[PDB]
Design an enzyme around this catalytic site. Structure first.
Site, PDB file in Angstrom:
ATOM      1  N   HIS A  64      -8.132 -35.612  36.592  1.00 17.52           N
ATOM      2  CA  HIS A  64      -9.358 -35.375  35.867  1.00 17.52           C
ATOM      3  C   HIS A  64     -10.506 -36.297  36.205  1.00 17.52           C
ATOM      4  CE1 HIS A  64      -6.688 -32.904  33.363  1.00 17.52           C
ATOM      5  NE2 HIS A  64      -5.983 -34.028  33.060  1.00 17.52           N
ATOM      6  N   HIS A  89     -13.525 -45.346  34.194  1.00 21.04           N
ATOM      7  CA  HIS A  89     -13.491 -44.109  35.000  1.00 21.04           C
ATOM      8  C   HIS A  89     -14.911 -43.524  35.043  1.00 21.04           C
ATOM      9  CE1 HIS A  89     -13.063 -42.800  30.835  1.00 21.04           C
ATOM     10  NE2 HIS A  89     -13.909 -41.783  31.252  1.00 21.04           N
ATOM     11  N   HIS A  91     -17.614 -39.858  35.643  1.00 18.86           N
ATOM     12  CA  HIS A  91     -17.866 -38.379  35.520  1.00 18.86           C
ATOM     13  C   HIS A  91     -19.047 -38.077  36.406  1.00 18.86           C
ATOM     14  CE1 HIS A  91     -15.389 -38.180  31.775  1.00 18.86           C
ATOM     15  NE2 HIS A  91     -15.911 -39.381  31.516  1.00 18.86           N
ATOM     16  N   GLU A 102     -22.473 -37.318  31.372  1.00 19.02           N
ATOM     17  CA  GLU A 102     -22.065 -36.636  30.146  1.00 19.02           C
ATOM     18  C   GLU A 102     -23.143 -36.715  29.081  1.00 19.02           C
ATOM     19  OE1 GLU A 102     -17.741 -37.976  29.360  1.00 19.02           O
ATOM     20  OE2 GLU A 102     -17.891 -35.853  29.913  1.00 19.02           O
ATOM     21  N   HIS A 115     -17.605 -44.933  32.325  1.00 25.34           N
ATOM     22  CA  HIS A 115     -17.073 -45.300  30.996  1.00 25.34           C
ATOM     23  C   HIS A 115     -16.105 -46.429  31.125  1.00 25.34           C
ATOM     24  CE1 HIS A 115     -18.049 -41.008  29.465  1.00 25.34           C
ATOM     25  NE2 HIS A 115     -19.093 -41.808  29.438  1.00 25.34           N
ATOM     26  N   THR A 196     -14.509 -37.712  25.113  1.00 22.19           N
ATOM     27  CA  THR A 196     -15.162 -36.538  25.715  1.00 22.19           C
ATOM     28  C   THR A 196     -14.178 -35.658  26.467  1.00 22.19           C
ATOM     29  OG1 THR A 196     -15.735 -37.645  27.779  1.00 22.19           O
ATOM     30  CG2 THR A 196     -17.388 -37.757  25.967  1.00 22.19           C
TER      31      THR A 196
END
Ligand SMILES: NS(=O)(=O)c1ccc(C(=O)Cn2cnc3ccccc32)cc1
Ligand SMILES: NS(=O)(=O)c1ccc(C(=O)Cn2cnc3ccccc32)cc1
Ligand SMILES: [Zn+2]
Ligand SMILES: [Zn+2]
Lengths: 261, 261
Positions: A64, A89, A91, A102, A115, A196
């Site tokens: 992910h 990590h 996004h 996000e 994050h 999230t």
């Protein structure tokens, strides 16, 4: 298992993970109507972030995102309890639409978002246990835009090709995680929200720094193109792109800011 | 009993309506990275939109919006079949946040949105039958911004206090529906999507006009305060507010524009 595209995508997360259709969901759009200055919001102190360059930290592709494991002596000071780090990590979007933060600001996505996940170690023994509990988690979010080459982000990005497929891992030598934070970390947005990603527990105290960092176009392209969601031997591979959640409704609530000007 | 808020809100629709978790969902954010000019998007022709003022058309609160039924002799020409009108309705925010359009443009909501729903009458008996067939539906969308008083939209809003509750019906004298459309209807966005409410069928050809129309603050306030999702005798009334879906992932779609700049 859950994904960001096809039938197991974000609108379907609430079938197995019921908190994904509950209250307090993140991320949200941060826009001026809903911001309110709060002078209670003093600077956080980042303790134990200068990771021993004689220690190694595990980078994993978990299907992910790409995640770096962090040690529990790293923590935030300044909140009512101590929150200890567990992992960081990212996004991001994709090269045709490279706007995959996000959180958004006045409706706009940044290129990507980092994050740094922490849990309340004064109350709970590990992040797993804290995750569904009151006051359990605190996440720091850094907005990322394209600009200058960033040597510090490259201390993570140079290892991406070793974690191309799901389940793969790599060791990263300790470095000062505070170098990933933007300018003027005193200036942030603060609100109570949720994870999230599944299970979407509504137990996160969010801190989104006001100012973005910059990475170069080539660094942003590498992040977008280096990874797959899928195991190496999957005959139907899926690129790891667009791994951010759409913004959620956020009515009759404020986001508090540590800045007024 | 789907809604826009709480347990039966939009992150849970897929639990009862599988297409809401499927591909090709609407609405979407219209932004430059996914726009492409298509010179083959020629102007639509609006025929039979000028409804007689001596005839009357049924206005109904369906529990989710307010809808006006339209006659089948109203059509759009220019598409590769004739599409006949079946109904129009609206989506809006609330009195403290009048920002309830469904589609957004470069990240920004408009105050509200009008949808005029058509089905392919060349191929189907009615709109219900058309709704699972590839491009069985064509919906026109008009973005509404807070501005001047609009006497044409008032031909609908002046009846709102007669359809305050779910199932209630009122008759609206005919007027020229084309007066609800903006300037320069030849400039539009076109894309393949879905119904924005359950059952979320991915069977809509969307046309979003480029230019908004204006209605006043007072007309928005009436729309935002007049109506209930619930029946007149329900002991847990629910105001019909914030009846718009969040924007959806693109799933690799482009949006084609009839305007090149
Ligand atoms: N993107 S974000 O910063 O909000 C975020 C941070 C952490 C996680 C998880 O740890 C998810 N996770 C993975 N295993 C888990 C076990 C219990 C609870 C949560 C678990 C999900 C999202
Ligand atoms: N907001 S939008 O313009 O996308 C939209 C327009 C029409 C509808 C329905 O008719 C919903 N509906 C209500 N009964 C139906 C039977 C078959 C198919 C759909 C049915 C839902 C959303
Ligand atoms: Zn995250
Ligand atoms: Zn609609």
């Amino acid at each position: 298992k859950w994904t960001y595209f096809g039938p197991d995508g974000e609108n379907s997360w609430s079938k197995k993970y019921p908190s994904c259709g509950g209250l307090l969901q993140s991320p949200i759009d941060l826009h001026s109507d809903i911001l309110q200055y709060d002078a209670s919001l003093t600077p956080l102190e980042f303790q134990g972030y200068n990771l021993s360059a004689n220690k190694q930290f595990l980078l994993t592709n978990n299907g992910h995102s790409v995640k770096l494991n962090l040690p529990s002596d790293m923590h935030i000071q300044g909140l009512q309890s101590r929150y200890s780090a567990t992992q960081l990590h990212l996004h991001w979007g994709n090269p045709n639409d490279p706007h995959g933060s996000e959180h958004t600001v006045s409706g706009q996505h940044f290129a990507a978002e980092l994050h740094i996940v922490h849990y309340n170690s004064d109350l709970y023994p590990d992040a797993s246990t804290a995750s569904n509990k009151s006051e359990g988690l605190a996440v720091l979010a850094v907005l990322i835009e394209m600009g200058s080459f960033n040597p510090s982000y490259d201390k993570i990005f140079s290892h991406l090709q070793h974690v191309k497929y799901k389940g793969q891992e790599a060791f990263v030598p300790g470095f000062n995680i505070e170098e990933l934070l933007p300018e003027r970390t005193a200036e942030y947005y603060r609100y109570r929200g949720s994870l999230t990603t599944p299970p979407c527990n509504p137990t996160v105290l969010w801190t989104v720094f006001r100012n973005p960092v910059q990475i170069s176009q080539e660094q942003l392209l590498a992040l977008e193109t280096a990874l797959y969601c899928t195991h190496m031997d999957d005959p139907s591979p899926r690129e790891m792109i667009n791994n951010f959640r759409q913004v959620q409704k956020f009515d009759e609530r404020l986001v508090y800011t540590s800045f007024s000007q």
